[PDB]
């Protein structure tokens with residue numbers, strides 16, 4: 001599969017319950033370290049195995065190349081393929097992660113693709129997953145159902161009519177963080193080359209899911225995914241799965257708050 005870097009794991013021996021695939025550019029070492037020290041820390045969560053890997057492509061920069069080589073050597077948690085790691089190549093990065101699950105970890109019960117500027121509550125996510133009784137053809141997150149392509153030319157998410165010629169996007173979930181049953185990875189990988197490419201990764205996955213007839217589902221009766229970010233509170237963060245707009249310093253502070261208050265009660 002032309003993988004330059006592969007994590008040392010055997011999902012056949014110990015099938016992980018939840019695999020986290022984290023998107024980050026080469027320069028965001030601070031983000032990756034904050035994640036490795038917080039929600040990315042591997043552990044058993046109610047007796048279920050959590051694994052964490054970082055998706056990276058390549059860069060022309062020789063300095064960044066060497067630092068990332070040393071990072072893979074020291075941590076062994078990087079999935080890499082030879083593609084120019086840039087904002088408009090995020091679809092390739094996501095498809096790399098899905099490919100990895102298909103080729104090396106089809107046994108994962110659940111997989112979460114996430115960004116780096118995020119807070120993830122794996123404890124609460126694990127709890128809501130064990131209650132969903134949804135183990136196949138499952139896909140959830142912040143549902144985006146009647147989205148219109150952004151035609152504002154200088155917008156970060158701008159797509160021309162050539163890049164995406166229709167008025168509305170298919171159903172999809174925010175790329176900030178989304179979760180799917182491990183089987184979905186093999187199906188998406190299979191249909192990927194037959195689906196119209198788009199540079200927005202979360203839309204593309206939505207295209208694949210629609211071609212597969214996989215319907216999006218809300219994970220819980222209450223919102224748990226917050227692409228818009230949130231006012232922080234220990235009690236709120238104990239009852240959510242994901243929150244965006246969180247920088248590394250802020251992530252460490254929030255993790256410390258949750259540890260400092262662990263064993264207090266909440267309304």
Ligand SMILES: CC(=O)N[C@@H]1[C@@H](O[C@@H]2O[C@H](CO)[C@@H](O)[C@H](O)[C@H]2NC(C)=O)[C@@H](O)[C@@H](CO)O[C@H]1O
Pocket residue numbers: 144147148149150157174175176200201202203227228
């Ligand atoms: C922060 C936010 O919610 N932004 C809204 C935006 O969401 C983006 O839509 C893109 C497709 O147009 C998608 O590829 C991005 O991943 C997604 N961003 C996030 C953070 O989820 C759209 O909903 C537009 C529609 O007007 O509104 C934005 O403000």
Ligand SMILES: *[C@@H]1O[C@H](CO)[C@@H](O[C@@H]2O[C@H](CO)[C@@H](O)[C@H](O)[C@H]2NC(C)=O)[C@H](O)[C@H]1NC(C)=O
Pocket residue numbers: 082083084085086088089092
């Ligand atoms: C996404 O990554 C691919 C693969 O690295 C890029 O394609 C290469 O781009 C370089 C530009 O210097 C060319 O020399 C190669 O011939 C290209 N090869 C392939 C495999 O197509 C592509 O440009 C990247 N996309 C973006 C948006 O930059």
Ligand SMILES: O=c1ccn([C@@H]2O[C@H](COP(=O)(O)OP(=O)(O)O)[C@@H](O)[C@H]2O)c(=O)[nH]1
Pocket residue numbers: 023024025026028055085086087090093114115116117156
């Ligand atoms: O070359 C790049 C640029 C960005 N990202 C990651 O992709 C996600 C989207 O980037 P950003 O946070 O800027 O996007 P937005 O939230 O605006 O969609 C983040 O996790 C970035 O770390 C990446 O892996 N490679």
Ligand SMILES: *[C@@H]1O[C@H](CO[C@H]2O[C@@H](C)[C@@H](O)[C@@H](O)[C@@H]2O)[C@@H](O)[C@H](O)[C@H]1NC(C)=O
Pocket residue numbers: 131132133
């Ligand atoms: C998830 O299942 C829980 C376990 O019990 C049920 O098992 C199913 C097979 C069901 O048909 C009954 O046999 C049992 O009640 C159940 O307690 C939860 O309510 C289920 N949750 C959801 C999301 O429906």
Ligand SMILES: [Mn+2]
Pocket residue numbers: 115116117244245
């Ligand atoms: Mn972000």
